[PDB]
Design a protein around this ligand. Structure first.
Ligand SMILES: CNC(=O)c1nnc(NC(=O)C2CC2)cc1Nc1cccc(-c2ncn(C)n2)c1OC
Ligand SMILES: CNC(=O)c1nnc(NC(=O)C2CC2)cc1Nc1cccc(-c2ncn(C)n2)c1OC
Ligand SMILES: [Cl-]
Lengths: 260, 259
């Protein structure tokens, strides 16, 4: 399970954004104060909150260099608050869009290897992340500067996919595995593939802009996502972004292929 | 001395604040992100003090010194083009994070400020405007294991061109020997900034009137003791009215890595 955090120990600071049924804030935790990130769940039903706890538990009961730490959950009136690791530079997508055209291929390859690494760890433990996207990739060390390499940390997947509505699942296209449109570790290989494209297209994922019906139509008509600009990831993404879950490579394979 | 920048190459954006005879803006250099220090309509002596400042920064290179791209000199306009530092002035941040800034964080800033100032010392160059405002935070060092990373800004219009009223406004950072009409002056600035850091962006006398401030220096009064006794000796050594009695930055840098 997960560690319990009293309301007294946490301080809510500036708003960083909104997740699926959550509001992300900067914050402090008394342990010596630590800079935390608070994911404040919306007033919710028992099934939604349980999906939130299950997510805390996944992140609490694991340990990897490229996985964000979960301090615990605080249960305050209608709100539940996940207390998570504060990462220096925040979401990757935001940064890649800000640094558009000035992000070198080697930088992107390091991020890929690191993301495949953390996802291979969850694979060997037979655990599903269920929300691999650029936003959920946080930059602990920036790596864009002469003589620097990036250091990423994969965020909690938020409210478990199982509790999400169809409308909510559609919003996750192109990262959402098409079999999840109507929970296997096979789903994270599609997420990894779609994120690999988002990284290549400097934080601009294909279909992001398109309408929910346009997005739903793409999956219904079994259409395939664009090819990455860099031909190094071209084979890997095509292998990952297959509609047949069994046809997706293992992260053990992906991790090997990335070293070449 | 200084690189010249054409007016066509620069785009002015959001006003960030005002300096001594300047207005600070966000800007674009043809398309890189910079900070434009737009000098007020000025006399030739004021503009020359501005160029001298550009030259100081232009002809130097240090990890904890802000970069100066050059000066745009067109007709009545004088614009210094400089490095944009992500989180901006330290004083603003320290006041925002008041009570939640740990001592170790402040020591790191101090060591970094003493290092950039030791570099100018070994080159026998005067900054002349060491204050909280002129320390810019490139990295906040908020995450565990992460440390802050500061960059010292240009000192603005050289102190030599400032009026008495303008010099009085720089109390307590201004060296008292600079009030009427040396690298020793930056040791006082460093000392007064070390107090401002300790008092979480609240420097002593900042609230007091110009006459109250002038009176403090005239009557040879000494600035308060820092809350943290680690910097207590260092600040007392730095904030002496005898310029020759101030430690070298070589000494300060040693003392910082021992207390
Ligand atoms: C587990 N740790 C984190 O989640 C986390 N950790 N650190 C930062 N640091 C920072 O931002 C540093 C720059 C100030 C941001 C983080 N999250 C984050 C921030 C903003 C929006 C979202 C969000 N969640 C869902 N959506 C759609 N968007 C979000 O979740 C990933
Ligand atoms: C060389 N580079 C700089 O000086 C500089 N670089 N980056 C920022 N970034 C930002 O602000 C990011 C946070 C939004 C601020 C900077 N200057 C600055 C901003 C506002 C006021 C003054 C100012 N100067 C004199 N006074 C009284 N106040 C000022 O000069 C130091
Ligand atoms: Cl970094």
């Amino acid at each position: 399970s997960f560690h319990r955090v009293d309301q007294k120990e946490i301080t809510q600071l500036s708003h960083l954004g909104q997740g699926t049924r959550t509001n992300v804030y900067e914050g402090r935790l008394r342990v010596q104060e630590l800079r935390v990130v608070l994911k404040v769940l919306d007033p919710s039903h028992h099934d939604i909150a349980l999906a939130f706890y299950e997510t805390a538990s996944l992140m609490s009961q694991v340990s990897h260099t490229h996985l964000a730490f979960v301090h615990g959950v605080c249960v305050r009136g209608p709100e539940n608050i996940m207390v998570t690791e504060y990462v220096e530079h925040g979401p990757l997508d935001v940064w890649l869009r800000r640094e558009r055209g000035h992000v070198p291929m080697a930088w992107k390859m390091v991020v890929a290897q690191q993301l495949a690494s953390a996802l291979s760890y969850l694979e060997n433990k037979n655990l599903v992340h269920g929300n691999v996207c650029g936003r959920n990739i946080l930059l602990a060390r920036l790596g864009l500067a002469e003589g620097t390499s990036p250091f990423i940390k994969l965020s909690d997947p938020g409210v478990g996919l199982g509790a999400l509505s169809r409308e909510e699942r559609v919003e996750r296209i192109p990262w959402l595995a098409p079999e999840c449109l109507p929970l296997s570790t096979a789903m994270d290989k599609w997420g990894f593939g779609a994120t690999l494209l988002e990284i290549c297209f400097d934080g601009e994922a294909p279909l992001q802009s398109r309408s929910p019906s346009e997005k739903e139509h793409f999956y219904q008509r079994q259409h395939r996502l664009p090819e990455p600009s860099c031909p190094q990831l071209a084979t890997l993404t095509s292998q990952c972004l297959t509609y047949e879950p069994t046809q997706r490579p293992s992260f053990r394979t992906i991790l090997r292929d990335l070293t070449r």
